[PDB]
Amino acid sequence: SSRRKWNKTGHAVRAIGRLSSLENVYIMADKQKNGIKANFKIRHNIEDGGVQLAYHYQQNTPIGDGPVLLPDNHYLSVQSKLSKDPNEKRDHMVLLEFVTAAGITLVSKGEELFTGVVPILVELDGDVNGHKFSVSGEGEGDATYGKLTLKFICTTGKLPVPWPTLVTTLVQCFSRYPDHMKQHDFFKSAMPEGYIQERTIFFKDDGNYKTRAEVKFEGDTLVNRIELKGIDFKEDGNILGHKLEYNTRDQLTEEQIAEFKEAFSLFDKDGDGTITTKELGTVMRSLGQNPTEAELQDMINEVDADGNGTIDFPEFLTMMARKMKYTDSEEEIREAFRVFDKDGNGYISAAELRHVMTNLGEKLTDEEVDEMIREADIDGDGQVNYEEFVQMMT
Ligand SMILES: [Ca+2]
Ligand SMILES: [Ca+2]
Ligand SMILES: [Ca+2]
Ligand SMILES: [Ca+2]
């Protein structure tokens, strides 16, 4: 293992790439509609390699005339796990989700409806390129923990699109908002009368969905009734071609955890178990970037679950586990590769890699840089090209 030297520096560059991207569900007040608007990106792994991106724009407006909470800018962080019921013959999805609000550093009447376990019903009618379908869902939400458990069935037979592409459409009122953020919870504030949620979802290099849903209490049950229309999809594309992975590949060897700790400790130079903006900035400069204090704070804020302004070890483990579960785009892998490929020629040289290593305070001898190149060098040219790098980073 000088795969270790790759793994570590690789993970650090990937950590930086994560910290520079916007992966959460971003919520802002929409005062003209007495509600909220949101935007976010969803990654769907393509079975056999690559990612299909789905860019979401969202708007919510209350159904009733009672006052609602309009929030400051914040985000929701969602962890989703998809599975199959071994006893179910119908085309189906079992979903477990945990959702928590964050993004604001360190209580409405409708919030009272969510202090215990609430039953949920979901009904969707869809039409994608003229292929119609219906989905029925049932389960329960426990907003105390941000927790949803639901099972969905396609009641019309075979679903004509992959299940994962419908997860976001198929009850953000179940999100866990921390104590210091309770006044920013629009979704609960609008209950029991509910809200109208609208989205457009753009699948990159493919078609789009347009959705409209009514989310409200019907008796004791929170019911989400949705209609969806998809247009412009390619018959051979990822969606109509069913080329998307179904299953959360959510491994996590103890060994993987240990490699994430090695990367963490490159940032946590004082060994206190948390990464500060000073520390993150130290590493970013050594890699050739020059962020301002404000950008360092916004980067941390992206993964700072507890809002203390630092990336604690468990927060970094969570971020890295998610970064490994969902595939990076080509543009993101190229950006990582450009951290090493200092001149932009397509090839990481022994001189470039030594410059990176030496700038990160790795005390490696010229001989050991050579061993690093050789580990990664599939074609024997004495350099690491893009494809060799891509394989090294898997
Ligand atoms: Ca530290
Ligand atoms: Ca923190
Ligand atoms: Ca180069
Ligand atoms: Ca090579």
Please say whether the beta carbons of 359 and 342 come within 8 A: no
Give the count of beta carbons closer than 10 Å to the beta carbon of residue 109: 12
- Return the CATH number of the domain spanning residue range 24-250: 2.40.155.10
* Residues pairing with 200 in the sheet: 57, 210
Residues within 5 A (CB) of ion ligand 1? 268, 270, 272
Token pair recorded at residue 308: 């203390």
Distance 364 CA to ligand 4 centre (A): 20
Token pair recorded at residue 363: 């005390």
- Whether the CA torsion 145, 303, 170, 66 is positive or negative: it is positive
Ligand showing the shortest atom-to-Cα distance for residue 283 = 1
DSSP β-ladder status, 311-312 and 274-275: antiparallel
Instruction: Mark the binding-site residues, compressed into ranges.
Output: 268, 270, 272, 274, 279, 304, 306, 308, 310, 315, 341, 343, 345, 347, 352, 377, 379, 381, 383, 388
390: part of which helix (H) or strand (E)? Answer: helix 386-392
Domain 1-23+251-394 is in which class? mainly alpha
Distance 387 CA to ligand 3 centre (A): 14
SS3 (DSSP) at 175: coil
Give the count of beta carbons closer than 10 Å to the beta carbon of residue 33: 13
Distance 370 CA to ligand 2 centre (A): 38
Residues within 5 A (CB) of ion ligand 4? 377, 379, 381, 383
Token pair recorded at residue 292: 């301002």
Where do the DSSP E strands lie in the chain? 25-30, 35-45, 51-62, 74-83, 92-102, 117-128, 131-142, 147-154, 195-203, 208-218, 221-231, 274-275, 311-312, 347-348, 384-385
Cβ-Cβ contacts under 8 Å for 380 (sequence gap 6 or more): none
In the block, tokens 């908002």 appear at 177
Cis ω for the linkage preceding 192 (within 30 of 0): yes
What does the DSSP assignment read for 252-320? Answer: --HHHHHHHHHHHHHH-TT-SSEE-HHHHHHHHHHTT----HHHHHHHHHTT-TT-SSSEEHHHHHHHH
To 5 degrees, how large is the angle CA 61–CA 66–CA 70? 50
In the chain, where are the structural domains located? 1-23+251-394, 24-250
Whole-angstrom distance, CA of residue 201 vs CA of residue 231? 11
Distance 381 CA to ligand 4 centre (A): 5
Instruction: Mark the binding-site residues for Ca(2+), compressed into ranges.
Output: 268, 270, 272, 274, 279, 304, 306, 308, 310, 315, 341, 343, 345, 347, 352, 377, 379, 381, 383, 388
Distance 320 CA to ligand 4 centre (A): 28
- What experimental approach yielded this model? X-ray
DSSP β-ladder status, 195-203 and 208-218: antiparallel
Distance 346 CA to ligand 3 centre (A): 6
Residue 281 dihedral angles phi and psi, to the nearest 5°? -60, -35
Please say whether the beta carbons of 156 and 41 come within 8 A: no
Fold match between 1-23+251-394 and 24-250? no
In the block, tokens 């200092």 appear at 342
- Whether the CA torsion 235, 237, 243, 249 is positive or negative: it is negative
Distance 298 CA to ligand 2 centre (A): 12
Task: Provide the CB-side half-sphere exposure for 4 (13 A, CA).
Answer: 9
* Residues pairing with 199 in the sheet: 58, 211
Distance 46 CA to ligand 3 centre (A): 30
Per DSSP, the chain holds a count of helices (H) and strands (E) of 10, 15
Torsion region of 57: left, alpha or beta (phi above 0 gives left; psi -120 to 50 gives alpha): beta
